[PDB]
Design a protein around this ligand. Structure first.
Ligand SMILES: [Mg+2]
Ligand SMILES: [Mg+2]
Ligand SMILES: [Mg+2]
Ligand SMILES: [Mg+2]
Ligand SMILES: [Mg+2]
Ligand SMILES: [Zn+2]
Lengths: 114, 177, 79, 39
RNA sequence: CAGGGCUACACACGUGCUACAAUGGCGCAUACAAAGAGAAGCGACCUCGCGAGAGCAAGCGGACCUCAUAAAGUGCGUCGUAGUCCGGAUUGGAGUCUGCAACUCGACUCCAUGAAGUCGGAAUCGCUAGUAAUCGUGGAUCAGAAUGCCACGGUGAAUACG
RNA sequence: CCUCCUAAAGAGUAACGGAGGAGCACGAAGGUUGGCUAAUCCUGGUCGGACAUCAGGAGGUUAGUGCAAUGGCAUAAGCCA
RNA sequence: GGGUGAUUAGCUCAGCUGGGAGAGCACCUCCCUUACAAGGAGGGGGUCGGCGGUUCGAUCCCGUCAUCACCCACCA
């Protein structure tokens, strides 16, 4: 099952096995299995060519895994060439969405740099 | 045999009509294809190279060949004449088989693909490229991984210029941004 | 993400848009306001954003679609 | 040994490969999003 | 008067919040309160949007109407020990409503992302019965927010030789 | 004890003259047959880095010769089986 | 002049017969204390005086230069 990238998930319920691939999560998984008419309590055992390519076509109706990555990259390049406040915080590693820079921003700032 | 014959008719006539050479032996043909894997972190684990050689003899059909360390350097803490890396040379029928099973079924399983680069030629008509993952070849069971060991490919041809080699590979898919 | 149904723009900046477009590149454009949203008619303009004491000469590029003035001009000198 | 690869593009293609097993694929050289990807 | 700034950030400490999981998390069916607030206010009912919202207008100066069908709890089916369906930061996009105003700044829905964290060094805090702990809710501030303050309810322990 | 210069183009030639090494190693590093040709730089190439392993080009002994130096070595005295 | 040993974190020593830099005091951040010192937990700090070199590679191996310490400098 070389679908959507390198992931061959196995022995999972498909409702989580579709979250297992980058760029696709829970609600998208539920909608894909509804559009393919697949029960939630199935396993990846006994899977066929139809059960590959119907899933891949229904997810190829969606933005996945390569162009999403370079879309994030192109948004970041657009903000850096913009030189906005948010672009400056993206380029210098500071929390963008209205946080406090003073205390406890270590997800964005990394570990403590003395 | 397939892409060999595909060359033998279409690429021969295509390149000859492109560059209007004096003769057919003056056309670029692919001469050999070599494959390298630098196993260097096996300075301690002696069988890391042994299993990497099994991996390359699963990718290729033929048994590989180890490489001797040319001259000792302290920059990489190696001794001269050390079990240091493994290569496979390919000519002829297995070479065309490897190119077939490369360009059909391996390039699109590269992680998050976009087309290959342009300036990757030597200048005298050769090509080389390096991979990151290694289940891009089908001969690797996914439950057999033990490192993220990549490898690099060299297509050595008689292209008298890199632009001639570019037009040689434009007869193939050869993604080409 | 914001500004539901019709954005909010400025009176005097809106006037100075026509005061520069219909009357040529006289000067850089001087506003004490940092609010209005960039429309593609404004391409080719030197405007000024005041940061607390000082103006910055903002030029507008094509990909400034839903973007904002003070979003282009931060107001904190660092280090 | 010569095997047969087959992708989702309908491209049934027999090749020599040392897998020792028949093959299922999606993307071939035919019908891959390369030119649509560049666009 | 306009605008920037207490919301900056090489770092330490205090107060707190959410988890690190299986007594847990999920999905479905599911029964049991209190004190509150309300007129420039609360907002049932229906229709569209998966949803956060929009229109209509009943009633209520109030034990009648609104906030509103609270949650752990019980049965079933589940994931069977992993950074896992645990956890939710950070970030891209698309939204909604508020308010002249959301860049310096918010609140929420969704799509996708899934870092460290597998029980915490020396030290340190509370607590004698419906409390310790855990789970919800209401108010005041306000035009908009709570993990903060004030108040209420559900379940509900251990130990005291000294 | 070995090597160069001082040694004046045969040999040799002193000084508390100027500069260096040896008191070992090898069962292959020896014999033979068949065979190969290095250093350094540039380019391209995943981790990979000024420099590991791959391919090509310039170059053509600057490299190697168990070790100090000198002589010599391509018919190789260097390297592989 | 001449024979012997030494230059290392802020301070003081072992690391030199060749391939990872250790010990003690100090420094910095926490902790108990009304507050220091002592005490308990946790970190980083050198490019081994300098110039050249041999070797794949030097704190270590070799030749000078600056400084320090020691011993000699007798017959007259
Ligand atoms: Mg008491
Ligand atoms: Mg509190
Ligand atoms: Mg003579
Ligand atoms: Mg003579
Ligand atoms: Mg011979
Ligand atoms: Zn295909």
């Amino acid at each position: 099952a070389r679908i959507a990238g390198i992931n061959i998930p196995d022995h999972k319920h498909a409702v989580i096995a579709l979250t297992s691939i980058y760029g696709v999560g829970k609600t998208r998984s539920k909608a894909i299995l509804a559009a393919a008419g697949i029960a939630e309590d199935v396993k990846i055992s006994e899977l066929s060519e139809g059960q590959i390519d119907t899933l891949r076509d229904e997810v190829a109706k969606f933005v996945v895994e390569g162009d999403l990555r370079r879309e994030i990259s192109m948004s970041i390049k657009r903000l850096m060439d913009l030189g906005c406040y948010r672009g400056l915080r993206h380029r210098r590693g500071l929390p963008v969405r209205g946080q406090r820079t003073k205390t406890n921003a270590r997800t964005r700032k990394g570990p403590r740099k003395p | 045999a397939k892409l060999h014959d595909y060359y033998k008719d279409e690429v021969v006539k295509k390149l000859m009509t492109e560059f209007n050479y004096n003769s057919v032996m003056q056309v670029p043909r692919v001469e050999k294809i070599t494959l390298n894997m630098g196993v260097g972190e096996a300075i301690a684990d002696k069988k890391l190279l042994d299993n990497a050689a099994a991996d390359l003899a699963a990718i290729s059909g033929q048994k590989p060949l180890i490489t001797k360390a040319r001259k000792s350097v302290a920059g990489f803490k190696i001794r001269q004449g050390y079990p240091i890396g493994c290569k496979v040379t390919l000519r002829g029928e297995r070479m065309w088989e490897f190119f077939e099973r490369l360009i059909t079924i391996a390039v699109p399983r590269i992680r998050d693909f976009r087309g290959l680069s342009a300036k990757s030629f030597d200048g005298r008509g050769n090509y080389s490229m390096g991979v990151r993952e290694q289940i891009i070849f089908p001969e690797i069971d996914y439950d057999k991984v033990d490192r993220v060991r990549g490898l690099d490919i060299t297509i050595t041809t008689t292209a008298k210029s890199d632009e001639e080699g570019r037009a040689l590979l434009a007869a193939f898919d050869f993604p080409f941004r | 993400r914001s500004l539901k149904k019709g954005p909010f723009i400025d009176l005097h900046l809106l006037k100075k848009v026509e005061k520069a477009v219909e009357s040529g590149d006289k000067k850089p454009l001087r506003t004490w306001s940092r609010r209005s949203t960039i429309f593609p008619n404004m391409i080719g303009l030197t405007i000024a954003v005041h940061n607390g004491r000082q103006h910055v000469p903002v030029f507008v590029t094509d990909e400034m679609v839903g973007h904002k003035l003070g979003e282009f001009a931060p107001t904190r000198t660092y280090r | 040994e010569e095997i047969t690869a087959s992708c989702s593009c309908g491209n049934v293609m027999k090749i020599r490969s040392t897998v020792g097993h028949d093959l299922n694929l999606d993307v071939c050289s035919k019908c891959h999003p390369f030119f649509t990807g560049k666009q």
